[PDB]
Amino acid sequence: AKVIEVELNDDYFNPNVITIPINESTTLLLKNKGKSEHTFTIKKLGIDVVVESGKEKNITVKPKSAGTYELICRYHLLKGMEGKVIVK
């Protein structure tokens, strides 16, 4: 239903606020354009994906509950590598 590219950079997400539709499928193209390994982790949406430097992971999600969900990189959270996903 929706396709969204998300860049994983050293050390931030772009975009770092992502809005996706409730009860519909969204494909996320997770592209690591950084030199470091990064993750795209949203525990409350059941997502936890590692993306190596220069590589890509493509996932399709279908969230059932409206809300705002914290997105983190497990490796660089403390450096501010964080964002959110709004399901609406």
Q: Is 42 in the site for Cu ion (CB under 5 A)?
A: no
CA distances (Å), origin 57, targets 5, 34, 53, 79: 10, 14, 11, 23
Q: How many CB atoms within 10 Å of residue 11?
A: 17
Q: Note whether 51 binds Cu ion by CB under 5 A.
A: no
Report the residue count for the chain.
88
Pick from 6, 20, 38, 69: which binds Cu ion (CB under 5 A)? 38
SS3 at position 25:
coil
Report the residue from 28, 45, 73, 87 that binds Cu ion according to the rule CB under 5 A. Answer: 73
Residue from 76, 83, 85, 87 touching Cu ion (CB under 5 A): that is: 76
Alpha-carbon distance 52 to 35, whole Å?
Answer: 9
- Judged by CB under 5 A, the stretch of 13-21, 30-38, 44-52, 56-64 that binds Cu ion is 30-38
The contact set with Cu ion (CB under 5 A) reads 38, 73, 75-76, 81
